[PDB]
Ligand SMILES: CCc1cccc2c(C(=O)N3CCc4ocnc4C3)[nH]nc12
C-alpha cells in the first residue's frame with residue numbers, strides 16, 4: 062500500500078537506477094532515472110511515470126539488480142566443465158520429484174548450448190547450491206513476501222557465488238492454474254549462475270520480468286550471450 066510514486070522510488074533504488082542518476086548529477090527529480098529504466102527494459106523513452114512504466118514496475122520479476130556496489134571474487138565465469146548442484150531444501154508447494162525434475166529440465170536447456178555439463182550431488186561444496194527462503198534467509202539480500210521479486214542468483218565463483226535462491230512466500234507450480242513456473246524462474250536464475258546479466262530484449266529468457274510461456278524458452282539473445290562467455 063505504497064503510493065504509485067513511492068513504488069517507483071523504491072523500484073528505481075532497488076534495481077540500481079537511482080545510483081546511476083546520482084553519478085550523472087540528476088537524482089533531484091524522477092525523470093532521468095525513469096529514462097534509464099525505459100531504455101534498460103525496452104519501454105518507450107518518455108522520462109515520465111506513465112501507464113507502461115507503472116505496469117512494468119508492478120510486474121513480478123528477478124531480484125538481481127539491472128545496473129550494478131556488491132564486489133564478487135574472480136572474473137565471473139566457471140573455469141571447469143562439470144558444474145555440480147545441490148538441492149539443499151524443498152518448498153512444500155510441490156512433490157520433491159517434481160521440484161528435482163523442474164531443476165534438471167532447467168539445466169538441460171543450458172547444457173545443449175554450452176560446453177558445460179550439470180550433475181546433481183548431495184554435498185555443501187556443490188558449485189550451485191539451491192535454496193528456498195523467506196525474508197532474511199542468511200545472505201543479507203532479504204526477500205519481500207508475496208509477489209514483487211521471485212528469486213535471485215549470484216555469478217560464478219566460490220562459496221555463495223553461483224548459488225540460486227527462490228522466494229518461498231511465492232506459490233511455486235509449473236505456471237499453470239495458480240503460481241509461478243519453478244522451471245522458467247530456475248532457467249532464468251541458472252543463467253546468472255553461469256555468468257549472464259539481464260537482457261533488454263522482452264522475449265529473451267534473461268529479460269528480468271516473469272513471463273509464462275508453454276513454448277521453448279531460449280531465444281537467440283540468450284544463446285549468443287552464452288557463446289560470448291564460453292569458448
Ligand atoms: C541479488 C544478488 C546480487 C546482488 C548484487 C549484484 C548481483 C549480480 C551481478 O553483479 N551480476 C549478475 C551476474 C553477472 O555476470 C557477470 N556480471 C554479472 C553481474 N548477480 N547477482 C547479484
Ligand SMILES: [Ca+2]
Nearest residue numbers: 188220222223
Ligand atoms: Ca556456490
Ligand SMILES: [Ca+2]
Nearest residue numbers: 206208210228
Ligand atoms: Ca517475493
Ligand SMILES: [Ca+2]
Nearest residue numbers: 229230231232
Ligand atoms: Ca511457497
Ligand SMILES: [Zn+2]
Nearest residue numbers: 123125249269
Ligand atoms: Zn535475473
Ligand SMILES: [Zn+2]
Nearest residue numbers: 198200202226
Ligand atoms: Zn538469497
